[PDB]
Symmetry: C2
Subunit: 84 residues, 2 copies
């Protein structure tokens, strides 16, 4: 989990599934808008799995969520969340 | 905002801690997030001299005695 601090990417978890869990927990999290933006720029890359973290760090902080997801697409296993 | 609380180059650590504590208590966040903010932002936003001491270090009283 009910805390944004506990949202961590699984070793085989697709980045899109991790982002969805992070987004849902952050929206429910009680914090100011600037703190939520800071939580995204800190915790999202920090709590990503080793493979995605390596990609995201090379990409830099000055990149959008769509650019992050495109760079991490297909990395890892299939996961357990059904999507179209 | 707690994010903007930064120690001055000549500002005593005790004065910085007082400003950090007052802003954190007024900040709207969960108890675990506030504890995490203390563990990350307090040392991170301290001046170069205090930051060097704090990284080598613990309770707040031990931090203030080491930075006095």
């Amino acid at each position: 989990p009910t805390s944004i601090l506990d949202i961590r990417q699984g070793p085989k978890e697709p980045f899109r599934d991790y982002v969805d869990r992070f987004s849902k927990t952050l929206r429910a999290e009680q914090a100011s808008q600037e703190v939520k933006n800071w939580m995204t720029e800190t915790l999202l890359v920090q709590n990503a799995n080793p493979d995605c973290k390596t990609i995201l760090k090379a990409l830099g902080p000055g990149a959008t969520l769509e650019e992050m997801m495109t760079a991490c697409q297909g990395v890892g296993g299939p996961g357990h969340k059904a999507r179209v």
